[PDB]
Structures are given as C-alpha cells and as structure tokens.
Design a protein around this ligand. Structure first.
Ligand SMILES: Nc1ncnc2c1ncn2[C@H]1C[C@H](O)[C@@H](COP(=O)(O)OP(=O)(O)OP(=O)(O)O)O1
Ligand SMILES: Nc1ncnc2c1ncn2[C@H]1C[C@H](O)[C@@H](COP(=O)(O)OP(=O)(O)OP(=O)(O)O)O1
Ligand SMILES: [Mg+2]
Ligand SMILES: [Mg+2]
Lengths: 129, 129
C-alpha cells in the first residue's frame, strides 16, 4: 500500500525520537461530516474489501515525512514538526489528489491538465490516446 | 483527380497506337442497375459537386494501364489488351476498393483488416488510434 522507499530514506534511531510528538488525543476533534468522507474515500484502503489499513492521525505525519525525503539530514527532523503542527491544527488544507495519492506507488499528484487539438487526424488520435 | 505518374511512365508514341483499340461501341451494353450505382459511387467525381470527370469506357483501360507501370517496356503494350478484353467482356469482376480507388493519389487498396487487443491501457489507446 505504501512506497518501498520511506524506510530506506530515514533512520530507525531518530524514528522513535520523532515518534513521541503525535499523541492521538488531538484525533478527537473531528466532525461527522469529516469522518464520513474520510472513511468514504480519503485514505489508503482496498476499494473492493474496504479493509482500512491506516489511521487519520498517522496520515499527516506520514505525508509530511514522505514529502521531505531529498533533504539534508540536519534539519528535516526539526522541520517536519512545523508542517505537522500546521496540518493537524487545520491551519492548512490539502486536496484529495495530494492526500488520496501520497506515499502511494502510483506517483501522480496533478489536479488539472489542458490539451488542444487542431485540424489533423493524427492529432485527434493522439489526443484521444 | 489522377496520380501524377502515369504520363511519366509511358510513351506518347505508343499511346495513340494503343488508343485505336477501345471503340466505345461496347459501352452500349449495360443495365440501368449498373449505370445507377456507377453514377452513384464507382468512378472519380467530386463528392460535393457531382461533376463527373470520367467515362465508364476509359475506366477499364486506365486501371489496366496503371496496374502495369513497373514492367519491361517490351510486352506490356501487348499484355494490357488481354486484361482489357477480360474486364470489358464482363469475364472478370473488380470491387469498389480497387475500382473506387485506382489511379488515385490516396494509394489504399485493401478490403479488410484485423486487430486484437489484450489487457493493457496502452494497447487500447493504440488500437483506438
Ligand atoms: N476520411 C476523412 N474524410 C474527410 N474528412 C476527414 C476524414 N478523416 C478526418 N477528416 C476530417 C478531420 C481532419 O482534420 C480533416 C482533414 O484534414 P487532414 O487530417 O489533414 O487530412 P487531409 O490532409 O487529407 O485533408 P485536408 O487537406 O483538408 O487537411 O477532415
Ligand atoms: N484506471 C483504471 N483502474 C482500474 N482498471 C483500469 C483502469 N484503466 C484501465 N483499466 C482496466 C483495463 C486494463 O487493461 C486493466 C488494468 O491493466 P493494466 O492496463 O496493465 O494496468 P495495471 O498494470 O496497473 O493493472 P494490472 O496489474 O491489473 O494489469 O484494467
Ligand atoms: Mg491536411
Ligand atoms: Mg498490468
């Protein structure tokens, strides 16, 4: 379900050090209109079994850790905390294309694309493909 | 309407020699069910103006001359007469793909094609194109 590079991109020692920053007590601040769509389609789960394999608390820190892979190993640990505190306190909002597709093997994160076709059969076949 | 290679593929001298073999007196042997579809869609004509630019007599000799371009210039003149006598006496029949598309710039003469698509998105896009 995840991408096989996160564990190979960080250290086990600092992992537990950063782990003691995400007490799940803040998870009890949602609304029904939130958890509804969340369980519907926002997090990783098999679309045929619906066996959810994640938790709305590890979501934010997981995406914040994955987005900061290629960085110097001197400030990323103290830098991910700011983004986590921003996303957890609902100060910054993120779409489905970025929360429905993060840390996922299929690396696609755009939201809109444009295309125009002129008078040519080959162009029409190409834009159809 | 024609292809700009026939005149560059034969000689003007033998042209008139082969010309005295196609007295149009045999053109008065059709049926209404023939000329109907012929004027409908069998010979070269603009599909928006319907200004016909051919004649059902020059059709056979034109296609027989065009089909015999790449040949030694020693027997083609005496060889095209056999095919013309075959097609004019209705002994051999020819489809629209070969009579609707001969001596035409768009050189396409097949009649059927096959294609199969397996389980792949790229394959589907390719076969659609
Ligand atoms: N088989 C067809 N017959 C008539 N029009 C077609 C056909 N296929 C596609 N078209 C439409 C869409 C094409 O953009 C347009 C023809 O342009 P094109 O694809 O460049 O072929 P073409 O060069 O033979 O015609 P044109 O000279 O008008 O551009 O007409
Ligand atoms: N976006 C899609 N989601 C689900 N199925 C799709 C999708 N697009 C096409 N399909 C259908 C047609 C494809 O042949 C088939 C998936 O096979 P494929 O094109 O090879 O992609 P894939 O490798 O990611 O899936 P699979 O491993 O099952 O082959 O499912
Ligand atoms: Mg064109
Ligand atoms: Mg596949």
């Amino acid at each position: 379900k995840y991408d096989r590079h996160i564990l190979e991109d960080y250290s086990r020692e600092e992992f537990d050090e950063l782990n003691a920053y995400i007490d799940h007590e803040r998870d009890m601040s949602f609304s029904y209109a939130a958890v509804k769509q969340l369980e519907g389609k926002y997090l990783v789960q098999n679309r045929v079994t619906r066996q959810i394999y994640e938790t709305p608390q590890f979501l934010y820190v997981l995406v914040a850790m994955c987005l900061f892979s290629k960085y110097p190993k001197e400030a990323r640990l103290d830098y991910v905390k700011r983004f986590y505190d921003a996303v957890s306190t609902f100060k910054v909002s993120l779409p489905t294309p970025i929360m429905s597709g993060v840390r996922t093997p299929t690396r696609q994160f755009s939201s809109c694309v444009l295309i125009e076709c002129d008078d040519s059969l080959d162009s029409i076949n190409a834009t159809t493909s």
